[PDB]
Amino acid sequence: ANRATSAFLDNPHPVGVNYVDEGSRQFVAVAELLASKLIDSSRESDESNSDVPFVQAYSKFADDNPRHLRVKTGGKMANALTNVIRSYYSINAPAIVPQVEIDRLASKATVSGDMYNSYAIFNSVPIVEVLSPARTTVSIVGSDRADVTMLNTGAGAANITFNFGQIAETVILKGSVPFQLARLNQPMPAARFTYKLRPLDGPFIVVLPVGNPLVISATAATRIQVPLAFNKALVESGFQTAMNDGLFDIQNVNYYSSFDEFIISQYHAQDGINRVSTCVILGLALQAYDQMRRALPVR
Amino acid sequence: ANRATSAFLDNPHPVGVNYVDEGSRQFVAVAELLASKLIDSSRESDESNSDVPFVQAYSKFADDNPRHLRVKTGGKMANALTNVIRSYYSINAPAIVPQVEIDRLASKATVSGDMYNSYAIFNSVPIVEVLSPARTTVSIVGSDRADVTMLNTGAGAANITFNFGQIAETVILKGSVPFQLARLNQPMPAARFTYKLRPLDGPFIVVLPVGNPLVISATAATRIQVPLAFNKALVESGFQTAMNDGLFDIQNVNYYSSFDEFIISQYHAQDGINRVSTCVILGLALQAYDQMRRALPV
Amino acid sequence: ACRDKTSANWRGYSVLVSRYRSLIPNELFESLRNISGEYNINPQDEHSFF
Amino acid sequence: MDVLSKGSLKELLAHLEKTPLEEAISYRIGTVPYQNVLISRNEYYNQLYPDTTSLIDGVSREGQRNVNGLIMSIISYVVSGSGHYIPNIGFMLLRRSILDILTKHDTGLVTNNLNYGIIARNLTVSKMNCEQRKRMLICFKLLAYKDGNQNDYEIYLNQNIPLKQIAPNFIPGDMRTVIHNQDQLAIVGIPAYRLTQSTELSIRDDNAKSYKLGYVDWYNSNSFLRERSEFNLIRLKDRDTKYGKLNGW
Amino acid sequence: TSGSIINHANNLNKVINHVFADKPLISETMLKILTIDGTTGKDGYRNWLD
Amino acid sequence: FLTNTTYDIVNNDTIDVLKMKLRNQGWPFVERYNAVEIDMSVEPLRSPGQ
Structure with a gap:
């Protein structure tokens, strides 16, 4: 038997265990609120041709008044937020933010x-494993939509089993040609183009007739509890800014193309419930980081 | 040796060189602001069961009162915005909006x-060239997520060189199976599923074993300076509308499936910095064109 | 009675504080932030004021 | 913050008598010390600023579950403002004051085997300042007189000349010596210079600055006790009296 | 913000002075209801409008 | 005044004990209320603003 799996689900590195208490989550919530006001004030300043609205918002955020010849970087709040974001990502990241600073902010x-x-709703499709017989070839590509290419070289029809884990709520399978899919120890229905599956049903068997390759496009949706201020568009932009800024460069960590893949991969691990709570806080922090950086830019 | 190149990076057409001064930039920013107010006023009019909010907004935008028999087009501001969009796309566009009209607007x-x-952040992945030896097949598909399918048919393992340009910030490569990649004149590490690279580091060599095909999925992120009012959701929708409305129907021009591919392709041309500033102005204009046309369909 | 008057007349006193601070230049204000004091009010005066 | 504001031997020793041992320990897991790390200091550089984690930073760190770790956490609290993570010590020990742990045999802790060389080395003493060193030498002196190791304390000071020059002069059993002492042991206070709201590169300096700016906020807040204005409102037990002396001294 | 508070207070007085000039817009019946606590009818209407 | 005690009896009492005593009698005003902060701006005119 040959085995294939999603690339992004392999070896989820541990997450931080610091700044996860009531006070710290309050600080991240405050940072997101004040970052949002910083963006709005910058717009109000621009349509009004006066620096007063921006100066007042920056004064709340940085506890200092902007001065020429000094670069506006966000002050102590920006410093604390950046280092806290690092700590959430990996357990190898240091904890260097004192508690008196978190309480003050x-x-x-x-x-x-x-x-x-x-x-x-998160769109990453988890394919934990795909097992195929000896005379078959299986390739899995993609994270937002998984394309599984299967070729049968032997004479007889092959049976390929699909495992989608137990976290995703729904998975929709569409094939290039109509195909047969049924649960274990269940009769196989007529060949259809689409299937709607609940991953908790169990491993699914797909018959692969000999001939032209069959490609299955997989789409999944999973539900994760997040704060009411959570905005997915802002979080993804913050994830890319943090990666480009170089603050995810820690030893022995995995890298992901989006926050969608990061949160799903941590979910599909041992003690995945506890990892998701930490990752949600990091997501809101990334939302604050994105808004603050756009308001105060560097070249 | 064979060469593989992303389709959307081939032969970027020259962009327009007009309407990129301070006065013209102010007009685009004004158009976005008033177009946004036009959308909000329509929502307020529907909620309040009155036409007073919409009449005020349309009068400011079009310098004329709305009329039941006449069609609502946006007036001269709509025509000027439509024409500058054509001028931004290609150097062969007429560029027939007077300066006095722009200053007054x-x-x-x-x-x-x-x-x-x-x-x-723009998510198009630039693959300038993939160099492969004989008896190897390489195919690149996609622009937002690029899949490189590699097949080895020779006796031994092959070395395949990837060139990601010099502009993109970070590139993340995830393969179907663990594989080996290293920079030039560097030892190869153990097989791994993921790789994070800087395109400035240099060409990267990938060892392709003999056997099943290897597919590498690429994702890149690039940072480009934009105004504070920039909205990627609105810009992309406006880009599709302008293509459907025929604003880009000019001779000797290229076409792209999204605004993200357009700006990255122009960035990677010879002296691409010259074109990024003009492309960003077109994006803000497409933002205003989206909001205006959705409020006032034609 | 104290609550009703406070809700009725908070706008006038809020404007008064804004006008008084407008009279102070910046250099004077930062210098005055170094000082501190405590004001003693007779209980009769505090209740009669409200 | 309260411990770092004490400026005299009298105030520092009085505070240690009042506070319990649970303040010295912390219940946050933190990270491990002596680890080379890359931190983000964006006001100064775009890259990541290298530094090394230590026990002297104001952040909680994991500590060893022994008497050596307990003493290091107490001295860290005195010289830095935060302690380490040593749980399940026991409520009998956690109720007692920091001074009682340091200079009383009734607590039950055995500290005779402690060596001042490694404790000073682990609680990095080449990175401390003058005020931090003085507080550590106070703790060493209190411990030495607890277990009758005065001779060992003297020999250790004679080996390290700079420590001898700044070593506080007081006998742990006599209150007259505490009154006469005029060393300045304050790490935070109202600054004569211009203190701004800016970051510092090192972990130790950034955390110390946070405590300094925090003390200014606390000094001007409603929790501070202005003696010149409300001296008649304090209770008689906690009022400042010259007859007042530490228990057992 | 100070500007919003100042703007609201000035507008409130302008409205109140207008609605009590000539024949008042508001009837004598509700002025009696708002005066029952002893406050001036003009002041009571200003509080209720806010 | 409310619990019918003298100052000497309640002299060595903490804030927690005093709050509990007053709440048992039925007095709910035992707390301090923070004041909201109003952002103020002074227009520049012929000098830098504040």
Whole structure:
């Protein structure tokens, strides 16, 4: 038997275990709120041709007044947020932010630190394993939509089993040509183009007739609890900024093309429940990091 | 030796050189601001069961009161915005909007017209060239996520060189099976599923074993300076509308499936910095064109 | 009675504070931030004011 | 922050008598020390600033579950403002004051085998400042007189000349010596210079600056006790009296 | 913000002075309801409008 | 005043004990209320603004 699996699900590195208490989550919540006001004030300043709205917003965020010849970098709040983001990503990242700093910045605004008000839908498709007989070839490509190319070289029809884990809520399979798919110890229905499957049903067997290759396009949707201020578009941009800025360069860590793949990969691991809670906080922090950096740019 | 190149990077056409001064930039920023107010006013009019909010917004935008019998087109501001979009795309566009018209339209609202106070991330992956030896097949598919399918048919393992240009910030490569990649004049590490690279590091060599095909999925991120009002969701939708409306139907021009591919392709041409500034202005214009046409279909 | 008056007349006192601070230059204000003091008010005066 | 504001031997020793041992320990897991790390200092550089984690930073770090680790956490709290992560010590020990742990045999802790060389080496003493060294020497002196190792304390000081020059002069059993001492042991306070809201490159300096700016906020807050204005409102037990002396001294 | 508070207070007075000039817009019945606490009818209407 | 005690009896009492005593009698005003901060701007005119 030959085995294939999704590339992004391999070896999820551990996440940080620091700044996950009530005070720290409050600080990240405050950072997102003040970063959002920084972006809005910059727009209000530009349509109004006055620097007053931006100066006031920066003063709340950085606890200091902007001065010429000094680069506006966000002050102590930006420094704490950047180092905290590193700590969330990996367990090898240091913890160098004192508690008195977290408490001071958390008090700057009165917002709730609860990170489970709402939910979000994540599109990464988890393919844990695909097992095929000896005379068959299977290739898995993609994370937002997985294309599984299967070729049968032997004389007889082959049976290929699909495992989608137990985390995803729905998986939709579409084939280039109609194909047969059924659960274990179940009769195989007529060949169809699409299937809607619940991954908890069990391994799924697909008959691969000898001849032209069969390609299956997989789409999955999973629901993760997130704070009501969670915006997926901002989080993805913040994830790319952090990767480009070089603050995800830690020893013995994995790298992902999006925050979607990062959160799903951590979910599909041992003690995956606890990792997802830390990753959600990191997502909101990445939202704050994105908005702050766009408001105060560097070349 | 064979060469494989991404389709969207081939032969970028020259962009327009007009309407890129401070006055013209202010007009584009003014158009975006008033187009946004046009959309919000329509929502307010529907909610409040009145036409007063929409009449005020349309009058400011078009310098004329709405009329039931006449069609709502946006007036001269719509025509000027439509024409500058054509001029931005190609150097062969007529560019027939007078300067006096632009100055009078930029005086309606107060905006800086600065297109360098923020940034945005563009996800197109540039694969300038993939060099492969004999008895090897290489195919590249995709622009937002590029899949490189490699097949080895020779006696031994082959060395395949990847060149990702010198502009993209980071590149992440994920293969179907673990594989080996290393920079030039460097030892090869153990087989791994993922690789994070800087295109400035240099050409990368991938060892392709004899047997099953190897597929490498590529994802890249690039940072480009954009105005603070830039919205990628609106820009991409406006890009599709302009193509459907025939604003890019000019002779001797290339075509792209998204605005992301357009800007990255122009970045990678000879002296691509010359074209990024003009491409960003076109994006903000396409943002205003989207909001105006959705409020006032024609 | 104290609550009703406070809600009725907070706008006037908010404007008063803004006008008074407008009279202070910046260099004077930063210098005055170094000082500190405590004001003692008779209980009769505090209740009568509200 | 409160411990770092003490400027005299009297105030520092009085604070240690009042505070319990649970303040010296921390319940946050933190990271491990003596690790080379790359931190982000964007106000100065675009790249990542190298540094090394230590026990002297103001961040909680994992500590060894022994008497050596407990003493290092106490001295770290005194000279840095935060302790280490040593859990399940026991409520009997955690209720007692820091001073009682340092200079009383009734607690039950055995500290005779402790060596001042490695403790100073581990609690990195080449990276401390003058005020930090003085506080550490106070803790060493209190421990030495607890277990009757005064001779060993003197020999250790004679080996290291700079430590002898700045070593505080007080006998742990006599209160007159504490009154007469005029060393300055304050690590935070109202600054004569211009203190700004800016970051520092090192981990130790950045955390120390956070405590300094934090003390200014606390000094001007409502929690501070202005003696010149409300001296008649404090209770009689905690009012400043010259007759007041430490228990057992 | 100070500007919003100042703007609101000035506008509130302009409206109140206009609605009490000539024949008042508001009837004597509700002025009696708002005056029952002893405050001036003009002041009571200003509080209710806010 | 409310619990019918003298100052000497409640002299060595903490804030927690005093709050508990007053709440048992039925007095809910035992807390301090933080004040909101209003952002203020002084227009530049012929000098840099504040």
